[PDB]
Every structure is written in C-alpha cells, then in structure tokens.
Symmetry: D3
C-alpha cells in the first residue's frame, strides 16, 4: 500500500520529467488502482511473444494473483529489497519498470504457481522465455521467497531443487546449480540473509547457513555454515561477515 | 536413431497439445505438422533466428538448403537431443531441447553458420553468429569445428572462438569460454576432446589440448594443456585428480 | 573519422556483391550515409528501438546528442579501430558497426551518458536497462568511459555508477566493474589507460588499476592494483608484470 | 445474450478440432471467456492494437466502457443475431465475432461513441480513424447507431457526425450516410428502424428515411424518403413499395 | 503460358535489383531466389497473408500444399499476370502484378481459399477470405468459381459472393460487386461469362447471366440478365448498345 | 501561410497532450518535438508507410530528400491542411488531418512518389503507390499531376490514374475514380480543373475536361467533357444545373 503510493508519486514526477515517456509511465503505473495490476501489465508486456501475446499472458498472471495473492505481497518486498540494497536505485518504481532481475523474479513466481497447479508445459515454456529474454534461468519447481534481489542478473541460473529463503541477495552470473544425471535433491538450499557475489557457482544439495556470505567468483562444493564468509575456488572459509544478515549490506 | 527419437517427440507433442490448450497450435506448428526432425528443426531455426533483415521464411530457405546439402547435421542434432535428455536430470522429454532450450538452439544455429562458412558464405555466417549471440547469449564463431552429442546446458554466456574444436560427446555449462589469446590470426583456441565435461564459468584460453575424457571444474581458468582422464581445476588450473568415470561428460559429476 | 569511414563504405560495396540477401541491409546501414555519425544514429536507432520508443524517435535523440557533443562520433571511430587490431577474428572496419554487441552497447552507453549529463536521468536509465536486456551489457550512464575501448564478446559485462574506464582499455565477456555497500558514493573501479581485463574478472569497490596493468581471466580483485602489474587468482595477488607497456593492445 | 454466447462456445469447441492451426486462436478469442463481454474486449483489443496503443491498453479502455454502459454488450449480441439470419453466407453465431470487419467496426464505433459521450474526443477520433484504415469503415463517434445492425462486407462505409441509425437496419459495402455543407450542425441522414440500404448508396444531408423503407443499390438519395417505400435511381425517385414490412430482415 | 513469363519476371528483377539499392534484397527475396513461379507465389502469399495468428512460415506450408495438390492454380496465375500486362497500360512488366497489385494478390489468395473449401477446410478458407478483405480490400467468398486470365485492376472495394462464377478472360474494376439477393442460401450471385469487362462501381445482384462477351457500364446496377455481346449501363441497367470488340475485356473500351 | 498553421498545430498539440495521457508521447513524438511542418510530415510519412521491406527510418531518409529537393511539397501540404479544416465541418483543428486522416496521408504520400517518379525512381514510386493503396485504400498513380489545397474526405476507394490532372482547390470524396480507358498508353484520364467538387462514388473515365468551377454529383459516371461552372450528374452524366457558388469545392453543396 505505501510502496504503491510512492510508485504512483514518482510516476507523476517522471511523467513531467520526460515527455517521450509520459504515456509509458501512464500505461505502466499511473493507470492502475494497485500494484497487482501494474505487475500483470508489466509481466504481460515483458513475457509477450507471438505464441502468447501480452493480452493472453495477462489473463494467466491475473489468474495466479487471484489464486495466490501473496505473490503480489512477495513482489512488494522484492521492490523494497532492491531500493535499500541497491545504491544505484533511488526509487520504488525503477525495479518495476526497468530491472530484469526483478522481472525475472516475478515471472518465476508465475511459473512456480503454474507448476504447483501441475501446469508444467506452460511453466517450462515461460522459464525458457525468461532465460532468453532476461538472461535468467530459474526452474519453476525452485522454492524462492520474499525480499530477494537479483542485481544486474545477466547469467543467473537456479535449478530444479533449489531453495532461496526470505531476505537473500544475488548478483550477475550466480549459479545455484546441480550435480549428477539423476533426479532428486541436488541444488543449494540458500538460507535467510545470505549474500552471493558476482560469478559464484554453488553446486549440489548443500546448505548455506542462515546469514552466510558467499564471495564473488567462489565455487562452493561443500556446505557452508551460518554466519560464515566462504570464498576461493574451491571454497574454504576465510571469514565471518560484518553484519548479522549480509544481504542487507552488500559488503 | 533419428526415426525413433522423432516418434517420441511427436508422441510427447500429442500429449502436450492436450495438456495446455493455449499452446496446442504452438505444439502443432513446431512439432506435430512435420513429417521428420529436419523439418521441425528448420521451423524452429527460422522462427528463432528471424529478424526484419532476414525473416523466418527466408532463414528457413537457407536452413533447408544446408540440410539438403549436408543431412548429417540433422543426425548431429538428434545426438544433441539424446545427450541432453540423459545428462540433464531437469529434462525428461525428447521435445524439451527442441522447443525450449537456447543451448540446443544455438548449437544448431552454429551448424548452419558452419555449413555457410564451409561454402565461403562468410558474410552470412558472421551475421548469424552475432544474431545468435544477441538472441541466445551464445557466441560461437562459424569456423569452429564442433561434433555430435553435445550439451550446452543453460548456455547463457558461452563463447567459442575461431580455431576451436569440440569433439563428440562433450558437455559444457553456462559462461564457459573456449576463447583465444593474441592479436594474430592462426591456431589459438582450445581443442576439447571426446568425453570432456566443462563446468560453469570455466575460461580455457589459447591453443591447448584437453585430452580425451578429461574434466574441467567449475570456475577454472585453464592456461596450460590438460591430459586425458584428468580433473583440472583452480584459478589458474592445476590437476587436482582423475575423474570418477571414463567419459565424465555422461555423468556431470561437478564434485 | 574520414579515413576509415571510406573503408567501411569500401567494404560495404564488396559485401553488397558477396551476399544478395543482405545488399539492402548493407545499403541501409552503411552505403546510404555521407559519414559515420549518420551510420551510427541509424544503427543505434535500429538496435535501441522498441514499442515505447521507435527507431525513428531514438534517432532524433541520438542526432541531438551527436550535434551537442560531436566527440562521441570520434570516440566511436577509435572504438572501431581498437576492435579491428585487437580482435584477430575481426578483419574489417565495418564488422563492429554492423554486428558486435559490445560495440553497440558501448555507443548506446555514450548516448545515455550524454543524457545523464543533461539531467535527463529517466531516459538514461530506460536505455541503460534496454541495453542490458538487448545486448547483455549492463552499464550505468553515470560511468566515465573513454575512447579506444573494446568489449569483445561482451555477454555479461557489468559496469556500475561510479566507475571510470580510460582510453585504450580492453575488456571481455562477464567482466564486472561492480560496487560494494548499500550506500551512494564512490564504490566502483577506476580502470586506467592501457589495462586488459580477461574473461570473467570481477573487480569490486573503489580501487585503482594502474596505468598499463593486466587483470587475468577469472580474477576477483578486491584491492588496488598497481601500474604495469599482472594480477590474477581469486582473490587477486600479483603473479608478475605484463609482456607489453599497454597490454590492452596485445591481448 | 446468454443463449447466443453458448452457441459461440459450442461452435468454438467444434472448430478447435476442425483446424489445428487455429485451435489456440479459437481458444484465445472464444473458449477461454466466461461471457460475451470478455470475448468482445479481447477481440477489440487485438483488432485495434497499434504501437501507439497496444492491445493490452485498449482492452482496459473497452472494459471500462462495458463496465460503464453494459448495454453495448447487449447491442452487440443483437448485431450478431442480425448477421446470422440476414447473411445467407454466415451460418454461425461466431463468424461475425471472429471474422467480419463490419461487425468489428460497428463495435469499435460503440467504444468511440462512449468515449465521445465522456468528452474523450481526442481518443474517439484516433480510434475512428484507425478503424477507417484497419477495417475500411469510417464512422464518426458522435453518430447515434442502435442495435441489430448489419454492415455486410462493409468496405467503404462512411457515416458522418450527425447521423442516426435506429434498431434493425442493414447496410452494405460503400454505403455513405454522409453530409453536405462546410458548416457544423444537422446534415446527416436519420435512417429509421427496418431500412435496408444496398451496395453503393449515397444518402446525403439531413433527411429522414422512414420506418421500414428500402434504398436500392447504387442510389443517391438527396431528398427525404417516406416509410415503407422503395427509393432507387441516381438521383433517387420512388420506384415502389418493398415486399416486407421491415426489408432489413429479408435483403430483397 | 508459364515458364516464358517466369524468365521475364527474373529478367526484369535483375534490372530492378540494380535500379534501386533499397529494394535489391526485396527483388531477390521475392523473385530472383526462386526456380519457378510457384515458389515466388507461395513466398508472396505467405508474406502478404501473414499475421500473428498465422505466420508467413505457416501460411507458406498451406499454399505449397495446395499448389502440390492442384498445380493448375499456378497456371491460372500466370494467365492472370499476362492479362494485367496487356490490359493495364499502367503496367509495363510481368513482375508488377506479382510484387505490387492487390487485385492480383487477392485473386491468388482466393484460389488458396477455394482449394481449401473444396477440401472441406471451411474454417481456414473463411479466415483467409476475411483477412484478405481487411488486408487488400477485396471480399471474395471461397466457394465462388473464378477462372484464369482475370484482372481486378485497382480492386479496392470488390465484393464477390458465395455462388458467383467468373469465367476465363474477364476484367473487373474497383468497387465492383458481384453480390446476392435474399436472406436464403442457394444460387443468388452473377454468372459472369468469358470476355466481359465490368467498369468501376458496378453492382450486379442476384443469379443473372452476363453473356459471353458483354460489357457492363461503370456505376451500373444490373438487376436483370444481360445478353452476349451487349453493352449494359445506367442505374438500373438497360441496354444502350453493343461493344466495339468481340471480347471487350481485352480492350478496356470504357465508353 | 506555413508558419501560422504550424504554430496552431503545436498549440493544439500541447492542449491534447494534457487532454489524453495515453497519447501524450504520441502528440509529442508526432508534433511537439519538431521545429517545423516538414519534419512532422517526414515523421508521419515514415511511420505510416513503414513496412518490413522499408522501415520508417529508411522511408524518412527518402521523404527528407524530397522535401530538401522540392520544398513546395511542404507548402502544398499546408494548403491541403487548410482545405480540410474549412471544408470539413467534422474537422475543427489544423492537426487532425496530419495525425489522423488517411485522405491527407495518401495525398502527401502521392507527392513523395510523384517526386520520385520525376527523378526516374519509378520502381520505388510504384512500390509506394501500391502500399498506399493497401494501407490507406487510395490508389494514385505517381505520374498524376495533382496540386495544392486538395481534400480527399473519407477517401476509402479513391482511384486516380497515370495521366490525370487535378488543379488547385479541388475536393473529392470516397470512391471517386479519376480513371482511364483503353489498353494503350497516352492521355486517357480526367483533367479536373480548379474549384471542382466531386461527390461520393463518382466515376470519371477517359481524357475529359471538367471545367474550372464545375460540380460532379454523387454517384455520377461522367463519360463526356463537362463545362466550367456546371453541375453534372446522372449515370451517365448530363447537365442538371449550375452550382450555387463560383468554386463549389469550398462549400460542399
């Protein structure tokens, strides 16, 4: 509710800032009563393709938001996460309009909901369109929570059996990928509060304890305990982070 | 092998057509309406490569030409499908690579640009090479010599340069670079041999062998040659062991 | 600018005959223009075009910027020369202009930079993020980047708000000149004249990279790096001194 | 409106099986909707979409109008019935909705009309002219048109600012309900309930066409025309009286 | 009358390719890259009928099917090309109808919908019929029986209804309606016979003959049958004379 | 006259920009961002003529060339704007023709193809002629000689052939055909003179004068010459009168 009024606020100012984009700001933000509508609009535009047009995607997204409204809530926490944690982002509207990490994340939620409902064929279709379109490959069966930030995002991979809990922050090229040719648990369970830096690779079914910090470039083959800074290739513990939840700080 | 894979695709397609009404016509357009795999492949390549400069319809003419002129490309692709199905535990269907997976699409798009480059049609090969980079996030120079039964899982970020070779039964992941060194033309890209796995975010630079059955770890930056049946790793790459199978491409043991 | 522009035009006439399907393309992009500045606005308009801002409208903006700061066109000619010599895969002055996303993203950065100078932030941000989606090269408009630069392959490059890249630098796929902290202010690398950075480096925070250094592939560089030094490893220690004065020219 | 909608849905299920290439089309346009109003907003959004206003954005506008004046949806159901009976080429309640530019233009008029009532003139005009280009039907939003209307073929229809068309009218290609003068004010026909107008009529100025008349094909009608009369000729004199009460229903 | 016409198209195309650089690739794509007329026609129809619902690539498959199944359609179209070139003094080239003239395109699109309707593929035939109305402003019901050597010059506004017939060597202009009467199915559309011209803005309603070689006046509204070798005209249509040539379609003497 | 019309367009545009938020950026893109009418015209023609074969950006280069080479086109178009505003009681704004009216667009697209044809760029002129037919339902051969202050109101169905002439201050409606006869090249299209109105669905065939100030009625099929200051009509066309004004184009009686 409060986040949505700032978006609308910022939008009125931007509409005056840049005439070329007035109608854009009006179409994406100002014409909607609430965030859920701005989200279906944005997802429809960003996922649209000849095979499924915006208008048809929007029907699907609205279905999912009608059926599990906490998605909209999740996304509002995802907006707040970016605004504080990204010093490049000074506005509640920037993620919603412009940031592929945020878009991919919300597109994941739709495919997740679809997969919950056993609508696998669609979930997979979208998963892969999102890869091509936003350069983020998240399997719909992954369990991701609220207040997440995929900053820059180009190159993120997250596989079938992964979990990401609330208040996590991830960067470009991070892979929460698997090992083996065999189905079953083989993807990381990343716990509440973790930061992962650019170009980490975290493979197999391994915990990353509640509050840990995976350094940039790190390749993490073994479990990593809470409140620990892992790093190196492959990853040994070089540290303990400077805050309880290093996701909020981005050291 | 190409007849049986094609009937499973068609089989799966009939079921999916019923699974998801919104996409019936999609499944029909991409898979069910075709007599064979080669047709489904030209369809898919035409749609995925299409651009105002060369529309699907025009790309398809080119792809069909190449498949008419070197039908083993269709064969190669059927081995690429089988490779993914077994090696990817996320992929439980012969149709998933064909419909959805940019690694598979980029790979087949490479084969077209390769054929073009063999025919001296360089301008086109380059055009496509770079469109495929933009469209699928895979940058493969057409002059590279890549074989059958290959898997570019996830694929975002793969680079493979002018003088590289990849032999049959190789498996590669996101961000792998088979890139070169120097400002000078000539051999300067890896020759990756039959059976290798390369993990996420490797960088393998210059003209260096990677022996038949080796395993390049994730994150690894590989400046010197790597012998057969060896597990390289680290930045830069030293040998930390020997892999757990003959051909670690088939297993995907990233440990 | 005039020397090459004639080579581009030359190469174009030959290519027009090489490949009939693309004659009209070569004519539209290169042969129909009196100078490089026009070929650049054409190419940027086509490559940045979107339903929200069509080629025709983007071109008006690019032409404005080139009218207002013509040294952009100059910068881009040095960017073309840089690629031709340093890329042994590229044997033609026209290849970067037509085909190479690194080159396109780089020039698109210059437009967003100019826009940001003029306080047209809303637009600069819009373009920054379209370029991320379209070319997989995220760059912040506020970064200060110079002439004779090469982003070879490019997929995955990130460069953040407070970065500097000086003249005669060469960067590869997945390089991140990214930041640290949740706070605004200087937090991105200042990469100096002559540096090469190899594939998949990650250079984080406000740190110098001295005039002529060489960052190895895969390297994660958390501390300052002195001139004429070869850093490497994860994290990065000095393993030597490069083989040329300015290792950007050699690769 | 309920019964017509179930036939559409019925026909759609059969067609979905008839033609695999168009399954997803039939599903997208007809089968996935609970009611006619939704199928109408869908169709109008797709057909009016343009880079300036995308389907998604048009749909929001159409849904607004249908929320604000639901009798539009009703009007359109009568327009569907009209075509099915009066067009011997049309054997299905779904054909107008999917395929017939006359029907589309007519419903697009209703949206621009509603917009113009709300003083949203700039939009109404924008759409009026997009519809001209897209469907070759130029209807000014300020015209007052009613239910059970059929614009069969439609290419070339013009209908001007001050025209009225009442319920149960039928019009063909190239018909112009156009005006005269350089001056604003009443200058367009008031066509009354039951009229047929044939191909390539031109009916100019502020003139009645009485309740049940029949304007022949090719006719150029400069003077008023009384009820239950067959006009014709260039210019139009009365050559008779039609064979039915309401010649719109017959198309003699 | 094919094959010689096709070499002139190709000839003209080579010259035009040099005339106009902006359109080289267009001339190459539509004409020069094809071995025969049938291919240029499927190309042309695919591009011109393409829509998000059915893309060029998909339409082309359908057109090729029809041309494989009833090759005389290609023949018919070559006679339609010849017809325009002689009868249109604005058209000095065998390629102009194929590239540019909506009458010619709509005509050939009719042939596809006709073939479809013969095969009982009504839903598609109707879809195309109406897309052609929107795209080319020509509304021809697929069930109409139209023959070779026809010219729809200008074409904007032509309507031709379910039960109409047009025989070989007919010429029709903008706004002509070969439309019907009644609310009832059955024969109710004109049977226009070999050699007729119809001028701009005629309206010919109901099941009525127009004899072999007649000439319909422009603006004419024709409610009764019209005998061979007769010039009808007026609103409604009475006979004002006899035309100046045997087959007034070939001349276009509109007086 | 071209300065003052252009300031009204710009004026109207700001008001409309506030009227309708969905279209602000449209009004800004088409009208407000341009220094003069010539730029707004190249913009509009580029967007409206754009196609996969020739994109807006490429068409605009061509239109700008023509306007640089024969600036009186822009002038012609300003007279075409004024013509519509007065003569169309449905049009109360100098900007309506420019944004929205296919008659106006087709007319200006004709001017480009005409210029191209004068320069011997026939292949392009023909390409555009026919795209305009498909896109705007107006079929005007580039070789026709058409003048300023013209109004194609509604326009759907207009045809105008190779050897036709339309002089200044003419007004034409939907379905009008200035078409020809014969299979033979040479003069065979009407020479319509200054001041004529032609009503809906006229058909005027062969090489015949229509004198300076005449009025062709709606539906009329005109096979013989028609003298100045005369009201023709009927099928075929005989003289039923004399019009109520000197130049019946300005009145639309």
């Amino acid at each position: 509710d409060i986040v949505w009024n700032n978006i609308k606020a910022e939008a009125r100012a931007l509409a005056d800032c840049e005439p070329m984009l007035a109608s854009f700001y009006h179409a994406t933000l100002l014409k909607h009563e609430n965030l859920g509508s701005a989200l279906s609009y944005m997802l429809a535009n960003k996922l649209a393709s000849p095979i499924m047009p915006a208008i048809a995607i929007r029907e699907v997204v609205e279905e999912a938001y009608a059926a599990d409204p906490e998605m909209i809530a999740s996304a509002a926490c995802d907006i707040q996460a970016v605004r504080t944690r990204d010093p490049a982002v000074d506005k509640y509207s920037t993620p919603l309009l412009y940031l592929k990490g945020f878009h991919a994340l919300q597109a994941y939620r739709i495919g997740h909901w679809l997969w919950t409902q056993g609508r696998r064929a669609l979930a997979i279709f979208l998963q892969n369109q999102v890869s091509v379109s936003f350069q983020v490959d998240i399997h719909p069966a992954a369990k991701i929570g609220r207040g997440i930030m995929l900053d820059h995002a180009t190159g993120i991979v997250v596989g079938e059996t992964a979990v990401i809990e609330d208040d996590v922050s991830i960067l470009q090229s991070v892979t929460l990928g698997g090992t083996g040719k065999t189905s079953g648990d083989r993807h990381p369970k990343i716990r509440e509060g973790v930061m992962i830096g650019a170009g980490a690779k975290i493979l197999g079914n391994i915990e990353v304890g509640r509050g840990a910090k995976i350094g940039a470039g790190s390749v993490v083959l073994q479990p990593v305990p809470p409140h620990t800074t892992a790093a190196g290739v492959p990853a040994r513990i070089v540290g303990k982070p400077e805050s309880d939840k290093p996701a909020m700080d981005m050291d």
